[PDB]
Amino acid sequence: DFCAVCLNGGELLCCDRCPKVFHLSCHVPALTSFPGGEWVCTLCRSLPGLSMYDQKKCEKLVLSLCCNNLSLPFHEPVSPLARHYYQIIKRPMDLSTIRRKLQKKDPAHYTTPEEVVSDVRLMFWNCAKFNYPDSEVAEAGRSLENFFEGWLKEIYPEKRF
Ligand SMILES: [Zn+2]
Ligand SMILES: [Zn+2]
């Protein structure tokens, strides 16, 4: 009943192989039209810039982040009006920036999975550098990073990073 990424209702696409449902633009990659049917989400699929193999793996990683309820504070960039944020944080990073750079036409498209992982960790580092350690946001960032580091060993057991 609820999009797995933004937790809002409306016109939702169901994945056949898992309970998850998505707004078309909340899925990764975003869909621009509905499918006829028998559709499976990026998490349940099989198989310059990223190789097609790494593209799908990094899409699984980024969608796992977006679908986890702890990622909500990190879905969009911080408002540049936000007091002191852009003075402390010289390299802001957020999941809408990561999503966009996963698109192969993007002029800053990722070329290696290490680049994707470096941005994710940059996001967690900025969170802990700016937010009060007992803020709700800082707690969500620490807990989400533990999820991410676990998925990394699951999706790329071989790579060191
Ligand atoms: Zn959504
Ligand atoms: Zn699924």
Bridge partner residues of 22 (DSSP): 13
Domain 1-47 and domain 48-161, same fold? Reply is: no
Quote the CA–CA distance of 124 and 106 in Å, as a whole number. 23
Strand (E) positions, 49-125? none
- Give domain 1-47's CATH superfamily: Zinc/RING finger domain, C3HC4 (zinc finger) (3.30.40.10)
The closest alpha carbon to 37, from 13, 57, 58, 19, belongs to 13
Quote the CA–CA distance of 117 and 129 in Å, as a whole number. 18
CA of 131 to the centre of ligand 2 (A): 33
CA of 14 to the centre of ligand 2 (A): 8
The closest alpha carbon to 122, from 152, 145, 155, 99, belongs to 145
Residue 19: how many CA atoms within 13 Å on its side-chain side? 2
CA of 119 to the centre of ligand 2 (A): 25
Amino acid (one-letter) located at 155? I
Ion ligand 2: residues, CB < 5 A: 15, 17-18, 41, 43-44
The two three-digit tokens of residue 102, written as one number: 């996963």
- Give domain 48-161's CATH superfamily: Bromodomain-like (1.20.920.10)
- For this entry, resolution in Å reads 2.1
How was this one solved? X-ray
**Ligand approaching nearest to the C-alpha of 8:** 1
CA of 81 to the centre of ligand 2 (A): 38
Q: 14-38 burial, b if ≥16 CB within 10 A, otherwise e?
A: ebeeeebbbbeebbbbeeeeeeeee
Quote the CA–CA distance of 139 and 158 in Å, as a whole number. 29
What residue spans define the domains of the chain?
1-47, 48-161
CA of 129 to the centre of ligand 2 (A): 34
Residues closing a segment before a gap in the chain (C–N exceeding 2.5 Å): 47
Helix, strand, coil share of the chain (percent; to 5): 45, 0, 55
Quote the CA–CA distance of 161 and 108 in Å, as a whole number. 20
Query: Residue with structure tokens 């499918």?
Result: 35
| CA atoms 110, 62, 58, 36: torsion sign | negative
CB-based contacts of 61, cutoff 8 Å, min separation 6: 116, 117, 120, 148, 151, 152, 155
Strand (E) positions, the chain? 13-14, 21-22
Q: 66-80 burial, b if ≥16 CB within 10 A, otherwise e?
A: bbbebbbbbeeebee
CB-based contacts of 50, cutoff 8 Å, min separation 6: 58, 102, 104, 109, 110, 111, 112, 113, 116
What 3-state DSSP class applies to 141? helix
Quote the CA–CA distance of 50 and 103 in Å, as a whole number. 10
The C-alpha angle with vertex 74 and arms to 116 and 71, in degrees rounded to 5, equals 90
Task: Report yes or no: 122 and 95 within 8 Å, Cβ to Cβ.
Answer: no
